[PDB]
Amino acid sequence: QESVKEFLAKAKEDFLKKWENPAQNTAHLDQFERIKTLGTGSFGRVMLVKHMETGNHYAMKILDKQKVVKLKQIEHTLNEKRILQAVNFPFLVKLEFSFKDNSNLYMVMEYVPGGEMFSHLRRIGRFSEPHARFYAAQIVLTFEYLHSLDLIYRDLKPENLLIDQQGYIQVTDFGFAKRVKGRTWTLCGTPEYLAPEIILSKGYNKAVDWWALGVLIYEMAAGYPPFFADQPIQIYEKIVSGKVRFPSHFSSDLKDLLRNLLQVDLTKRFGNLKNGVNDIKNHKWFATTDWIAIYQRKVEAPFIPKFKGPGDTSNFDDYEEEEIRVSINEKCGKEFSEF
Amino acid sequence: TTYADFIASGRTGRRNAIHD
Numbered sequence A: 001q002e003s004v005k006e007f008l009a010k011a012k013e014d015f016l017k018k019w020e021n022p023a024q025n026t027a028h029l030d031q032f033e034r035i036k037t038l039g040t041g042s043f044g045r046v047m048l049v050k051h052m053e054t055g056n057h058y059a060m061k062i063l064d065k066q067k068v069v070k071l072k073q074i075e076h077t078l079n080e081k082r083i084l085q086a087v088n089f090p091f092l093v094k095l096e097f098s099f100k101d102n103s104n105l106y107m108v109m110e111y112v113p114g115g116e117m118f119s120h121l122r123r124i125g126r127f128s129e130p131h132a133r134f135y136a137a138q139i140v141l142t143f144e145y146l147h148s149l150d151l152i153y154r155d156l157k158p159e160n161l162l163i164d165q166q167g168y169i170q171v172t173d174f175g176f177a178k179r180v181k182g183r184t185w186t187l188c189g190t191p192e193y194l195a196p197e198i199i200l201s202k203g204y205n206k207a208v209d210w211w212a213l214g215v216l217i218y219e220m221a222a223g224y225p226p227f228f229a230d231q232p233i234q235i236y237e238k239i240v241s242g243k244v245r246f247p248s249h250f251s252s253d254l255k256d257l258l259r260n261l262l263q264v265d266l267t268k269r270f271g272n273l274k275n276g277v278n279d280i281k282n283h284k285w286f287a288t289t290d291w292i293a294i295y296q297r298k299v300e301a302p303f304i305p306k307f308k309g310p311g312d313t314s315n316f317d318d319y320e321e322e323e324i325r326v327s328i329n330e331k332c333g334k335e336f337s338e339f
Numbered sequence B: 001t002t003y004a005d006f007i008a009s010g011r012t013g014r015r016n017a018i019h020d
Ligand SMILES: CC(C)C[C@@H](N)C(=O)Nc1ccc(-c2ccnc3[nH]ccc23)cc1
Pocket: A038, A039, A040, A041, A043, A044, A045, A046, A059, A061, A093, A109, A110, A111, A112, A113, A115, A162, A172, A173, A175
């Protein structure tokens, strides 16, 4: 048995070694069979693929270099790959291979067949407080880990939380994650999840991730987010107004935790104070949570997705399938040299 | 109800990230 201080110290030594000497060019597109698109958007696409050499399935994130440049995501993309190849935690999807070709950048991660929390939460409607707390404890531990390595995650939401066959969470999508000791200023995130200090264009720090945890716990427990509207500008007005309403079925403990996470005043927001994450972990809402048992995956999960077989994609929606075009000329060579 | 207001809203599907 070791302390958390001691676990994190060793975790930092492990991380820094990979951070300072990143892995590069560890596979080639030709080793993979394409099966199905799992997600798309202007920010890239993710495809289910099979590795011929092992028969393993993977989730391959594909980014078009020229579109990354037009979206001003060059440095964010180098961040994502550099950080992901360096981290190691039970609730983070693992990066298995990365490489690039003339046209695209590729990150090959482990495939999580249970799907996004997003789809289960929306169908079922809402999670019970014990169910929500099980998931929230995993994010609390993950943020403890990431934050200790000077990493900010900046995109927590149900869309980015996959449910594995044991019913535990895997965080995916590190496209806005960043290693920063001071403050930082980029406008990024998702509207419903943005802290007031992002909206107000202040320099901000890892406290934005703790605010986003409050939004997530609310959304999981209520079935809808604490600030919603038809357009983002209207969401921002609600977020900065300083007001929140809880459902009557929320426990007293839950409301009190959420008041301290959805706290506009940075000198008062849980996560950010002298006692750090322990203000959260020692809160009464988490009194039943055995943090080691969660880290060890020894707790029985409240929900187990349906298996159906290796490669089955039923727990994911259908997307339009698009070619993987590889130009015969190298694009953006300088910009992505370190990838 | 707040649920009905959310369900009638245009932001009940997967949400994209923002950027400037
Ligand atoms: C890529 C974005 C810029 C586009 C976004 N809209 C999106 O689709 N993200 C997304 C994230 C994870 C998966 C996924 C599904 C199953 N198992 C998995 N293992 C590891 C990742 C994974 C699929 C899609």
